[PDB]
Design a protein around this ligand. Structure first.
Ligand code: J72
Length: 345
């Protein structure tokens, strides 16, 4: 038999025999690190348990399978192998995704102070991964630090492809990085992801979540509290019922960016460091913009002085993926077969 079974906490991992010394590194679902004896390297293994059980799990799993396959960019996680231990459609239950492995979540990097070279390089790569996605027509909308992984040598990759919806999960879905246009459901374009990058970068500097809060109500309060109530221009673009709510909230003038992000948070002992600090804060002030009509584009932000030192036309303008009916609604049974079909290939 090609498979063996091993307990990893309260989950059984049934994986191919090439994969060994599994260690839980996540529970973005159930993930193990493993040594792959065939390729002689370490891999990440994600167990998708009954991905067809509901529409939300099934859409995400199918979208994860399809896109991780036909996307080949250094700043997006690579798929190495896909398998099920079950032998037929009737028996079918679990999918295992085999991805390349890095060293840490972006959560762990946020907890440390970084020099400007590393901070700016990470930010450059996030912008690269996102841009490649946009040119395939993939707008992410859910970039968060737990979806972003890094290696010791400062290399960065994005793990997921974002938003495609009720669920009975014990866990909560994080909202802290979602854009004003998503929170208020007002439509969006490419620069919806720039907001998310601004939240991450600001968290990298402050070492705290910029806009925490239990709900979209609490979350909006936090946004306007720090950045100020947005313009009439912005207001006039809101559905009258959303617009009623936003316009009838307590008003804040908001804080200037020097106030929101003081120099004590940036390395600024030397002159090179002092200049980078002001470049980093400028770019923050252009990403953390509520009105997406005034928020910086992905291309403008790659051309920004803080970022552009890393600019590579091969990394920034890589041939867009080819890629298909991806607003799909299906039953459990239909999803089951689409996924199996894709897994079996
Ligand atoms: O690098 C990855 C990864 N690659 O697919 C990966 C994939 C995931 F689904 C989750 C995390 C991933 N991490 C972060 C990570 C790597 C480790 F070797 C060890 C740990 C890591 O983070 C948690 O703490 C332990």
């Amino acid at each position: 038999n090609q498979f063996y079974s091993v307990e990893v906490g309260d989950s059984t991992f049934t994986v191919l025999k090439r994969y060994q010394n599994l260690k839980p590194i996540g529970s973005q679902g159930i993930v193990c690190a493993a040594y792959d004896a065939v390729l002689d390297r370490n891999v990440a293994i994600k167990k998708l348990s009954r991905p067809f059980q509901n529409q939300t799990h099934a859409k995400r799993a199918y979208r994860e399978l399809v896109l991780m396959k036909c996307v080949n960019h250094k700043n997006i996680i690579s798929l190495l192998n896909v398998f099920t231990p079950q032998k037929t459609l009737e028996e079918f239950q679990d999918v295992y995704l085999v991805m390349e492995l890095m060293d840490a979540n972006l959560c762990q990097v946020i907890q440390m102070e970084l020099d400007h070279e590393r901070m700016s390089y990470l930010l450059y790569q996030m912008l690269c991964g996102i841009k490649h996605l946009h040119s395939a027509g993939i707008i992410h909308r859910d970039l968060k630090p737990s979806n972003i992984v890094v290696k010791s040598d400062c290399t960065l990759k994005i793990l997921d492809f974002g938003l495609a919806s009720f669920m009975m999960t014990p866990y909560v879905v994080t909202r802290y990085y979602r854009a004003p246009e998503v929170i208020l459901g007002m439509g969006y374009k490419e620069n919806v992801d720039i907001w998310s990058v601004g939240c991450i970068m600001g968290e990298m500097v402050r070492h705290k979540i910029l806009f925490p809060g239990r709900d979209y109500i609490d979350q909006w309060n936090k946004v306007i509290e720090q950045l100020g109530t947005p313009c009439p221009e912005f207001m006039k673009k809101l559905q009258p019922t959303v617009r009623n709510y936003v316009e009838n909230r307590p008003k804040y003038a908001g804080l200037t960016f020097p106030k929101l992000f003081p120099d004590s948070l940036f390395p600024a002992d030397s002159e090179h460091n002092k200049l980078k600090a002001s470049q980093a804060r400028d770019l923050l002030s252009k990403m953390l913009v509520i009105d997406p009509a005034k928020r910086i584009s992905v291309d403008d932000a790659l051309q920004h002085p803080y970022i552009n030192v890393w600019y590579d036309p091969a990394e920034v303008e890589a041939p867009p993926p080819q890629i298909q009916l991806d607003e799909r609604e299906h039953t459990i049974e239909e999803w089951k077969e689409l996924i199996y079909k894709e897994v079996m290939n």
